[PDB]
Each structure stands twice: as structure tokens, then as C-alpha cells.
Design a binder for these strands. Structure first.
Ligand SMILES: [Mg+2]
Ligand SMILES: [Mg+2]
Ligand SMILES: [Mg+2]
Ligand SMILES: [Zn+2]
Lengths: 102, 64, 70, 189, 75
RNA sequence: UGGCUCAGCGUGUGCCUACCCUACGCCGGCAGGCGCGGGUAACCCGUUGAACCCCAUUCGUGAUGGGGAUCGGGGAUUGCAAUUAUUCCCCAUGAACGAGGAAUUCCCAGUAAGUGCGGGUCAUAAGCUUGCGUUGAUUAAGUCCCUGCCCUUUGUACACACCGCC
């Protein structure tokens, strides 16, 4: 049974997509098929900010961040629970999960 | 060279941890510096407001 | 902190580095603790910069195309 | 003032640390004539605090099968032992008890389910309520084990256990296991 | 630590030790004297109440299981 | 070893069916025996004078006055029948056993445990079970780690259903 009309990848008008390596298990996955993370994390912990601010020589010192682009095969993506198997109806939508900002 | 034994006061209970209930994780403020506060996992019954010893300053801090 | 204090150093510019290359770019759990303890031990923190090796395009990553099976 | 066992006024004893001040019941509100009360101390959580600690030691001193209901015998052994420690130290027996309880309760331990090196894996500091409970149990087991196959009786063996615990000489079984638990926790940090 | 082989009956070398140094410390009981002087312990109970009759030792408890004595007050 | 001192369930004379619960007096050291009685029962047993425990004695860290297994002799009761000992008593022996590996059971307040007492079985009888009572705690007010259970999603080549199929 054809599970997804998308065929599990973004390849629509192409014929071949150059592969990447899974950042976790180093598996060759097509670039448009692997699940991509872009995490903009604080360079320090959420509880270490207060300690660093005391020892910062600059009073108005902006906090640098970390820019990491992760790529995952669906094996490592499911194993790390970054994606989950969804119902037949719930599979179709492509909206990202809510950010839980408030 | 050596950090001495101190005490900290529980402010709020965060929840159980250890996948057995053998430990509870609570937030503790420092009596020496009330602004200074960490989160510590403790064993045994803990409720709000009680003060307990802490043999070392920082060991672990994770969010459940 | 003890060696720097006894050699006459009071501030630091922390330069973080992960494994880099084609390997992992996320620093391990030791990054947060070592950085936090340096400031809490009575030492100043200035500019923090990243020197993680980020290739344009690296060589082949070790493991094989089927990955590290586990 | 309440004259526990007919003597040993409870208004002069004091707890030398605030972490256990609110969990020991040597205070005047919980100052009782006799360590014997069926006040339903297991009905709800956080109700063993208001139970008098002299009663708590009496509860924990009956174990090992042959002694599981006998409280008259346990109270009379406590009565003998407190008089004995008074005769051997010259201060209030309750002050000896509070010194022993604080100095016996281990302040850290370790408990995990994953892979363990020696005993457990991760070090976790204990609660004040668990401090007291482990302290009383360790003192009772130390007295019982020393008294199991020697001519010294329970009142005397309980006396030297609490006396060596009040000072601290690595001879009390309670402080001996306390140091072992602290060292294991330090290794498992 | 194999067998106590304690003293069922007194001898001169221990009887004098009972008479001179036993009523000098705070806590004297039949168990303490039995382990200290290596006497049996039935002899300990009898000898302690002999010193009670001589009046140089004060009794406090007098229980069937835990009978407790003490030295006289000094000062 | 002696003294002290407090329970609650419940049973008790029978169609066939014979076989009751026992106060008191006397005899014997005991198991027992003999006569007066009572009770078809909140009426008598029975204020069920239980045990544990408590208070005093002796013992004194030894396989000892712990333990009573095995075994000899003797005496009664029930039954027609007691040997392969029915049960009980007395005097004899005093065996392992010094807290028990891997594992494993049960349990949250009048609970575990200690401790005895009724019923069922019974002419004879409880180490069984079913109920009752006394003394009375430690830890815990959590988790899905182990063993499992429920709901949803999901995959399946399973449907005798994973102890499946292959
Ligand atoms: Mg499929
Ligand atoms: Mg192709
Ligand atoms: Mg796998
Ligand atoms: Zn992967």
C-alpha cells in the first residue's frame, strides 16, 4: 500500500537528490528525505545565566547563541522521539507542531 | 579549598523522579543567599518550606 | 581556577569547541558545567566564541552508508 | 515540666540545627509523661512528626519476630536505659537522645535502577524526615545486634549505643553505617 | 572469642578487685562486672547485693531483668 | 518457678442415630475415676478468672536450665478391635539447629507480627481450615524500573492468535 502520496520525501520534479549523513548514526539519507532540525539554543544553561551575569566584565553583555543544523534518518528521529507515528488522518497535515511560546 | 556543609530551604515541589518514586525533585533557595537558588533531587518525604542540609553546592539540574 | 589564581589570571575568554569536522557539532554535557564553574569559582567571563571545526565540505564520514547499527 | 518517666524535664533540651528542629518532637507541645500513645500516627502522611520521638524510639525498638507487639517491655527497657545514660553522662537523657539522633542520621545516600558500580549509581541527599527515620532504625539495630549473643542486656546495650552516638567514636553502629553511606554517596556523585 | 570460661566462684585475686575498684565508677550492673572481672554473672548478682548490704553501693532500679546499682556520692 | 491480672466470636443432650456442654463433693501425684446436680440455654457451664503480657526467683553466653527430635519402661481414657505405637499422663535419652545460598511469599492501621480461644472434622482427637479476642508498630501517600492490566495511535506475513508464524 502506498502509505504517503508524498512518498516520504520532498522529491517532486527532481530525479536524484544528493545525500547527507545522519548526524546521529551516520547513515546516508537523501537530503530531502531526512528530518531536519534547526536548533537555536542558548550557549549556556537556562539556570546558568544568572551565575555568568555576575562574573561578566560587560554589564550589558548580550548572550551568544548556538546554531546547529541536525539531520536525522527516520530511525534516529523516531528513536529520539523528535517525530512520532500519527494516525491515518493525522498524517496528512504538514503544519509544524506549536512552539508553546506562552 | 573545600566547600563546607550548608543548608537550603525548599520553596516548591516539582515532581517525582527516578522512575520508581524513590526520589522527589524540589527547588531549594539558599539561606546564605536567598537570591541564589537551585533545583535538587532528594529522597524521603519532603513538603514545602522545610530546610535540609546540602553537602555540596552544585551537582545536577534537569527539567522533567 | 586554582592554577590561574596562583599564576596571576583573573579573567577568561571562553572558546568552546565540539568534536567538529563531519562528526558531532553539539558540545557534550561537560560544556555547561565547566563554563558555569569557572565563573562561580571567582573568575571573570568576557567574550565567548566558537571554534568548532565547521567544514565547507568534509571527507567521507566513518561508519558506512548504512550507518552504525544499534 | 512534664517529667517524662517522672523526671528529666524537657524544657532544657534543644536541637542544635534548624533542619531537624521542626521534625523532632521533644518540644513542650509534644512533651509527654510516658512514651506510650495510640494516637493513630499512621493515618496520614506528615503525622509522624508530631508523634513524640521518645515514643518513636519505643516503636522501632520492637523487631526480629519475638517482639512485635510488646510495648510494656519496650517502655521499661527505655526507662532503664534513659536512667542508665543519665547515670553515665550526668545530663538530661533526652539531650543524649537528640545528640544521638542528629549524629546518626545519614545526610546523603544513593539509589538508582540503572547500572551500578559498587552499590548504586547516582548520589542523592536525603530529607530531614528520612534522616530521623534512618537514625532511629540504625540505633535500634545497633543495640539489638550488640545485645544478641552477649551477657549485656538491652537497656545497657542501647545505652552505650546512644552514648557512643552522642559523642561520635566510630563505635556506634548507627554512625558506622552513616559514614559508610556518606562515603558511598561521595563516590557515586 | 571461643568460650568465656568465666569464674563461677571467687578467688583472692579477683575478690579484692571487687572490694576496691568496682564501687568507684558510675554504672555498676551484674552484666558490667561479669564482663569486666570475667566472673560468671550469677556470682555477679549475689556479690552486688552483698555490697548492697555493706552499704557502699546504692541501688536505683531493682527490676527482675535490669537491676542497676551505682557508686556512692563523692563530695 | 511463684504471684498478680484483664477478652470476644460461638457451641452444648440427637427422627433415623447409638455419640451432649459440664458446676460441686470425694479418691489419686497426673492422665483419670465415683455421686450429686444444672442447662434444649442473656436462665446452667460462665463475672467463659484464656494466652501473651506484668511483678519477683533462679539461670549466665557453653548446643547450657535454649531445643525436644529419636527412643525404653509404666499407667488411664474412647472404641468390638489401639500392633504399623488413636489420644493423654509420668519417669527415662537429649539429635540437628548458633539466623540459613540462588531465589521467593505476603503486606498499609487496629494492618503485619506475637498471642491464645471457639466452630468444622470428632466414639478418639488439630501442627489443617474457618471465625474471635489481647498487645501493637517500622516504612510508603509514589513509580512504571521488573511482573502484569486498561484506553488511544501504530505495524503485522499472527487468527490453534508470539507458547504465533517461518
Ligand atoms: Mg506496510
Ligand atoms: Mg533514480
Ligand atoms: Mg535500533
Ligand atoms: Zn540515524
Amino acid at each position: 500500500t502506498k502509505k504517503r502520496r508524498n512518498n516520504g520525501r520532498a522529491k517532486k520534479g527532481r530525479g536524484h537528490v544528493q545525500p547527507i549523513r545522519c548526524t546521529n548514526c551516520a547513515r546516508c539519507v537523501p537530503k530531502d528525505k531526512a528530518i531536519k532540525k534547526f536548533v537555536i539554543r542558548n550557549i549556556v544553561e537556562a539556570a546558568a545565566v544568572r551565575d555568568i551575569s555576575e562574573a561578566s566584565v560587560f554589564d550589558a553583555y548580550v548572550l551568544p547563541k548556538l546554531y546547529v543544523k541536525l539531520h536525522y534518518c527516520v530511525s534516529c528521529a523516531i528513536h529520539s522521539k523528535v517525530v512520532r507515528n500519527r494516525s491515518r488522518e493525522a498524517r496528512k497535515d504538514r503544519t509544524p507542531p506549536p512552539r508553546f511560546r506562552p | 579549598r573545600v566547600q563546607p556543609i550548608k543548608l537550603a530551604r525548599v520553596t516548591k515541589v516539582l515532581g517525582r523522579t527516578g522512575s520508581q518514586g524513590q526520589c522527589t525533585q524540589v527547588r531549594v533557595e539558599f539561606m546564605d543567599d536567598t537570591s541564589r537558588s537551585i533545583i535538587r533531587n532528594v529522597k524521603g518525604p519532603v513538603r514545602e518550606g522545610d530546610v535540609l542540609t546540602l553537602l555540596e553546592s552544585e551537582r545536577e539540574a534537569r527539567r522533567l | 581556577a586554582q592554577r590561574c589564581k596562583e599564576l596571576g589570571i583573573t579573567a577568561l575568554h571562553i572558546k568552546l569547541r565540539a568534536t567538529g569536522g563531519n562528526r558531532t557539532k553539539t558540545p557534550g554535557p561537560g560544556a555547561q558545567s565547566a563554563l558555569r564553574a569557572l565563573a562561580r569559582s571567582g573568575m571573570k567571563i568576557g567574550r565567548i566564541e566558537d571554534v568548532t571545526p565547521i567544514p565547507s565540505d568534509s571527507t567521507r564520514r566513518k561508519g558506512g552508508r548504512r550507518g552504525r547499527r544499534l | 515540666d512534664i517529667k517524662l518517666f517522672g523526671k528529666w524535664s524537657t524544657d532544657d533540651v534543644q536541637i542544635n540545627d534548624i533542619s531537624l528542629q521542626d521534625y523532632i518532637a521533644v518540644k513542650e507541645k509534644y512533651a509527654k509523661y510516658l512514651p506510650h500513645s495510640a494516637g493513630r500516627y499512621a493515618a496520614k502522611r506528615f503525622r509522624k512528626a508530631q508523634c513524640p520521638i521518645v515514643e518513636r524510639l519505643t516503636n522501632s525498638m520492637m523487631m526480629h519476630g519475638r517482639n512485635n507487639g510488646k510495648k510494656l517491655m519496650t517502655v521499661r527497657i527505655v526507662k532503664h536505659a534513659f536512667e542508665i545514660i543519665h547515670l553515665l553522662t550526668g545530663e538530661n537523657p533526652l539531650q543524649v537522645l537528640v545528640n544521638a539522633i542528629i549524629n546518626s542520621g545519614p545526610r546523603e545516600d544513593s539509589t538508582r535502577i540503572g547500572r551500578a558500580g559498587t552499590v548504586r549509581r547516582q548520589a542523592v541527599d536525603v530529607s530531614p524526615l528520612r534522616r530521623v527515620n534512618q537514625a532511629i532504625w540504625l540505633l535500634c539495630t545497633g543495640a539489638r545486634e550488640a545485645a544478641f549473643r552477649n551477657i549485656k542486656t538491652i537497656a545497657e546495650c542501647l545505652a552505650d549505643e546512644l552514648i557512643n552516638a552522642a559523642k561520635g567514636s566510630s563505635n556506634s553502629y548507627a554512625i558506622k553505617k552513616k559514614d559508610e553511606l556518606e562515603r558511598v554517596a561521595k563516590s557515586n556523585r | 572469642r571461643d568460650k568465656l570460661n568465666n569464674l563461677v566462684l571467687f578467688d583472692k585475686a579477683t575478690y579484692d578487685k571487687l572490694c576496691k575498684e568496682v564501687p568507684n565508677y558510675k554504672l555498676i550492673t551484674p552484666a558490667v562486672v561479669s564482663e569486666r572481672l570475667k566472673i560468671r554473672g550469677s556470682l555477679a548478682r549475689a556479690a552486688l547485693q552483698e555490697l548492697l548490704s555493706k552499704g557502699l553501693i546504692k541501688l536505683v532500679s531493682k527490676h527482675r531483668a535490669q537491676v542497676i546499682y551505682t557508686r556512692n556520692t563523692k563530695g
